[PDB]
Amino acid sequence: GDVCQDCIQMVTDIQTAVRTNSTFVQALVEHVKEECDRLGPGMADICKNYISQYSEIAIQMMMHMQPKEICALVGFCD
Amino acid sequence: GASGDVCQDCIQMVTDIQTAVRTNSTFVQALVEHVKEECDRLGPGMADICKNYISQYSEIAIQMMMHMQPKEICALVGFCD
């Protein structure tokens, strides 16, 4: 679909950004951690530790598969 | 450069996702069914915890993403700005 093709385009350029931009992943992880602040006082911290331990497996898992597999896994393709 | 392409791809994809929710009656169903099936890779007690965390919070997720411009959504996930 349209959303499927857009997702493959996005994941392809994200893997390109991780390969070429050294600060892309750091800035992205810092931004998602900054969006954990919208939770409560105690529960923002577990959100940032959730990213702190699962960003690595997410980024490396993304870079070890093809983009159509990524979008098939997320749900925008097939 | 490479990250600006990611921002452009995000705007296009989120705009087409908003269109697909407004124009296809089965898009949201199939998407949340696939996300619930993807919870099964976790532990057997907590695959169901994952599934009903998706169930309790799919309504906020779809409706909040509906009442938002695609640029705000991409800025929130970090692919833009």
Numbering used by the authors:
A (entry chain A): 1 to 78
B (entry chain B): -2 to 78
Task: Paste lines from the article.
Four mature saposins (SapA, SapB, SapC, and SapD) result from proteolysis of the precursor prosaposin as it traffics to the lysosome. The saposin family members are disulfide-linked, four-helix bundles that usually form dimers. SapB presents a variety of ligands to several lysosomal hydrolases, including arylsulfatase A, β-galactosidase (GLB1), and α-galactosidase A (GLA). One cargo, globotriaosylceramide (Gb3), is presented exclusively by SapB to GLA for removal of the terminal α-galactose, and failure of this process leads to accumulation of Gb3 in the lysosome and ultimately results in Fabry disease.
To determine the molecular basis for SapB binding and presenting Gb3, we expressed and purified recombinant human SapB from E. coli and co-crystallized it at lysosomal pH in the presence of Gb3-NBD. Crystals took months to grow and were bright yellow, strongly indicative of NBD from the ligand in the crystal. Third, we dissolved washed crystals in 0.1 % formic acid, subjected the sample to liquid-chromatography mass spectrometry (LC-MS) analysis, which indicated the presence of both SapB and Gb3-NBD. The SapB structure revealed a homodimer consisting of helical V-shaped monomers that form a ~2,900 Å3 binding cavity lined with hydrophobic residues. Given the above evidence for Gb3-NBD in the crystals, we were surprised to see only weak density in the ligand-binding cavity. Additionally, several hydrophobic residues on one face of a helix in the binding cavity showed little density beyond the beta carbon. We interpret the result as a collection of disordered ligands in the hydrophobic cavities of the SapB molecules in the crystalline state. Absent any cargo, the binding cavity collapses, and the cavity volume is minimal; but the presence of two Gb3-NBD increases the pocket volume closer to that seen in the crystal structure, suggesting that the SapB dimer in the crystal structure contains two or more ligands. Moreover, because the chains of the SapB:Gb3-NBD dimer align well with SapB dimers containing ligands, we propose that our structure represents an open and multi-ligand-bound SapB. Our simulations indicate that an open SapB dimer binds at least two Gb3-NBD molecules.
